[PDB]
């Protein structure tokens, strides 16, 4: 493991978390993918269903230059 | 520059590595979505969230250079 875990019961929205160790003052751009609100970074999934659960990740790209930074969260949904 | 695929709910699809690769050379795969043939993605009894944009990523066997592309996935029906 090593992954945290954001658990939600079905049909409740969700925020996902980036967890890249990212910068301050840095201006990121974001990406998004499954692998098969104030935060800044999160991924918003409406009316989350039982097939929504798995792991993600976050990949956050410097504007300038080529680096990035990328962290893996875990979704469980919950309900029927 | 990315295509599309349609497919019938319940129907099977196989999506395709768009990845421009090279033949003979021997890649590992990794697919993710966006928010027998070799390196093809499959995915069997389709329904409506299956929709969406996905990517492979083929890794050279260096591991300092890999390869990828997109690819859409829209699954349709009647009811």
């Given at each position: 493991p090593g992954t945290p875990e954001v658990k939600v019961a079905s049909s409740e929205d969700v925020d996902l978390p980036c967890t890249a160790p990212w910068d301050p003052q840095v201006p990121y751009t974001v990406s998004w993918v499954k692998l098969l609100n104030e935060r800044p970074y999160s991924l918003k999934i409406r009316n989350?269903?039982?097939?929504?659960?798995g792991t993600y990740r976050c990949t956050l790209q410097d504007p300038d230059g080529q680096r990035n930074l990328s962290g893996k969260v875990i979704l469980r949904v919950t309900g029927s």
């Open positions: 989350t269903t039982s097939s929504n659960s």
